[PDB]
């Protein structure tokens, strides 16, 4: 039917989850222009004329659509080979956000941002950091996320000899947060206290969805490359032929609980190897201090997590973790946990206070022919309907 | 301002006159897919992955959006070097339209459709044929125009000995239609009876805006190439260095009036040379054959039009043409003309009757398979239009 077709098309342009929505289509034009505007390609009349025709229109669109110049760097909080994570401020609104930058040159040359963009944009979970905006240019991919003023658990652990009650609270919240990721069909693969952020209320939210892999019908993943941080990496991810499930995320929870209660990671070494050697021989290298500061149940939970896959707590689902004695407390309940009073409530001067975060501080060659470097990134643009 | 930018962007996507509206953006993706889907280019990972990613959505869009397969050829009515012109019927609605097809291939071998598309789409004039839809594929540009069941003036002239009273009606209507085009900032450059179509009521509409050129601040045009039909071409367009105005359109009106009243074009010959030579020498070649038929005022109007541009009627605007004695008549006023009863009212069986149009007949040369990106669809991005 005639107008049915226009309506179906209009919904194709409407849909934020659609690959052909207005922003995905603007991505295409923008990519095409960047991918064609080179002197060698402009020798082609078709390319030259098209670029001349669209010059004014593309400059207008580029100005109107969200750009790097709309934000001001307040503080640099993270750094990777792929890019930086920084605390920014929208120049007009003065609102503080977290911005993750990914180098397009680094994406193409030895590669994930799709799932990272999707989890943060459409998770609608109190456990996952919300993504407000996703935009780009010929050099970077940008992810404007909700600001978490309480900082990370690394900062918390560096200020306190974490009492058990707090360790129980943060472990329980990570279990819930990980169970949320798992229900979406993903294994985090990089669970660590640097990726656990605290909101204004002091409750946890997960970050870094950059290693998230979608599980299969058997809830497994085929990966032959090591992923994650040396201290938190499970033996199975280290040994990766590789066919593993969501249990690698539970191994990291046991590393996290040990770290909070002991003050050090269980398999710490002077090198990348030796760390990896200790993880392999966790059976004889996992030891606790000879003192009464860590309870029987805490030690058992760590050990129930720090074992081989097939015997690890969480191989029969969350309920077996939720039911562990370590979680028995007269302070919270699993279904009421994010509504309880957090152990550490951030005492922030203002909504723009960045105190809880420590301040830190080449692209593509010119083509001689069409190579289409912007094509892997068409559709990355995303804008939230959320107002303030 | 933040919200402002999204609204401004939201207007740009909506605007039918915008270069970045939803349909031009769909045109871009479609173009890009056609120009990249070749085995040689698919050796490029970026191109290969992109095409794989967009396979399903491109097939959906292609199916949903208007296509050639939505229309059925009723009759072939025209044939140019750049494509055909045919009377079509939308398969679902059963409504008859006129469709102009332009071969994107042929066009690439030395290239105008922009102004033709724009005049017919945005003219909103009872004198200009309305373009309902403009769409395309990897091979053709399509223009779905309103159907004019009375046929053209060539057909009319071939069936009747045009009395001076009818000649006045059709001349007056062309004057109004041309004045409408000039007010939009264009010179038609191809005024001829073949491009004058009649509606159900017997009223004229100008068609084929394939030679239309936009005037400058001085109401002039820089063109060094001859444009139009040999018989109707003005001396100034023929002499083209070339810097001319809207007066070339008025020369053609004088050819049209002469043709209707005389039964032959004033500078006719058995070649494209014999005719071109007869135009350059209009001062001695213009003659009226022996009769009591053609009135004093009719001859004066023809001559006031068939002169050099600096002495031609219409160099001081339409009012001097409108005021000519030839137009003095009791039946109509310039302001009441398209509301009057036409001299010939088409006697059509139905709204789908195509009898005033002669049917013509109906394996194409197409773009070679690229070994590298060539971007053949790029000249046509933005052509899609839906009213
Ligand atoms: C000190 C840190 C927390 N380790 C910095 N590293 C990263 N932080 C964040 C992030 C997300 C949302 C946020 N809201 N407020 C702050 C904030 C920070 N995302 C990342 C994603 N991939 C890698 C590293 C990071
Ligand atoms: C014998 C004819 C009618 N002159 C055929 N030649 C052309 N016809 C038309 C056209 C437009 C709208 C119409 N509506 N109803 C009929 C109809 C015909 N457009 C053109 C555009 N460029 C060149 C030639 C033509």
């Amino acid at each position: 039917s005639f107008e049915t077709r226009f309506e179906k098309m209009d919904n194709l342009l409407r849909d934020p989850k659609s690959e052909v929505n207005s922003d995905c289509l603007l991505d295409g034009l923008d990519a095409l222009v960047y991918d064609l505007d080179f002197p060698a390609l402009r020798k082609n009349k078709n390319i030259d004329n098209f670029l001349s025709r669209y010059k004014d229109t593309i400059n207008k669109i580029r100005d109107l659509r969200m750009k790097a110049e709309d934000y001001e760097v307040v503080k640099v909080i993270g750094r990777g080979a792929f890019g930086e994570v920084q605390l920014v401020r929208h120049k007009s609104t003065r609102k503080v956000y977290a911005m993750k930058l990914l180098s397009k040159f680094e994406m193409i040359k030895r590669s994930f941002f799709w799932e990272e963009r999707d989890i943060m944009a459409f998770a609608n979970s109190p456990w996952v950091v919300q993504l407000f905006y996703a935009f780009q240019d010929d050099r970077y991919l940008y992810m404007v996320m909700e600001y978490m003023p309480g900082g990370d658990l690394v900062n918390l652990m560096s200020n306190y000899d974490v009492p058990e009650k707090w360790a129980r609270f943060y472990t329980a919240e990570v279990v819930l947060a990980l169970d949320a990721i798992h229900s979406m069909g993903f294994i985090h693969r990089d669970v660590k206290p640097d990726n656990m952020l605290l909101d204004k209320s002091g409750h946890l939210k997960l970050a870094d969805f950059g290693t998230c892999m979608k599980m299969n019908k058997e809830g497994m993943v085929r990966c032959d490359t090591a992923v994650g941080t040396p201290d938190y990496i499970s033996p199975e991810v280290l040994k990766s032929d590789g066919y593993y499930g969501r249990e690698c995320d539970w191994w990291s929870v046991g590393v996290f609980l040990y770290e909070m209660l002991v003050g050090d990671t269980p398999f710490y070494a002077d090198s990348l190897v030796g760390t990896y050697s200790k993880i392999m021989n966790h059976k004889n290298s996992l030891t606790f201090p000879d003192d009464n500061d860590i309870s029987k149940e805490a030690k058992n939970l760590i050990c129930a997590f720090l074992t081989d896959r097939e015997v690890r707590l969480g191989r029969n689902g969350v309920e077996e973790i939720k039911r562990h004695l370590f979680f028995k407390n007269d302070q919270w309940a699993w279904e009421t946990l994010r509504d309880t009073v957090a152990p550490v409530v951030p005492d922030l001067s203002s909504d723009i206070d960045t105190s809880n975060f420590d301040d830190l501080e080449e692209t593509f060659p010119i083509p001689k022919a069409f190579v289409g470097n912007q094509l892997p990134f068409v559709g990355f643009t995303y804008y939230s309907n959320r107002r303030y």
Side-chain angles (χ1 to χ4, degrees), chain A residues 156-174:
Chain A
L156 194 135
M157 287 159 87
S158 69
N159 297 149
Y160 299 103
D161 181 19
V162 177
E164 278 213 25
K165 344 152 232 148
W166 298 14
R168 191 189 304 118
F169 175 87
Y170 306 119
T171 305
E173 291 216 316
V174 171

Side-chain angles (χ1 to χ4, degrees), chain A residues 331-370:
Chain A
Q331 8 284 165
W332 54 257
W334 289 98
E335 35 274 310
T336 212
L337 178 66
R338 227 188 184 277
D339 306 312
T340 61
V341 62
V344 180
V345 185
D347 178 80
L348 312 139
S349 46
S350 49
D351 46 13
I352 66 109
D353 179 71
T354 70
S355 166
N356 286 300
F357 292 95
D358 305 353
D359 196 357
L360 267 283
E361 84 95 61
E362 164 200 57
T363 207
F364 297 114
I366 298 297
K368 292 90 188 149
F370 187 85

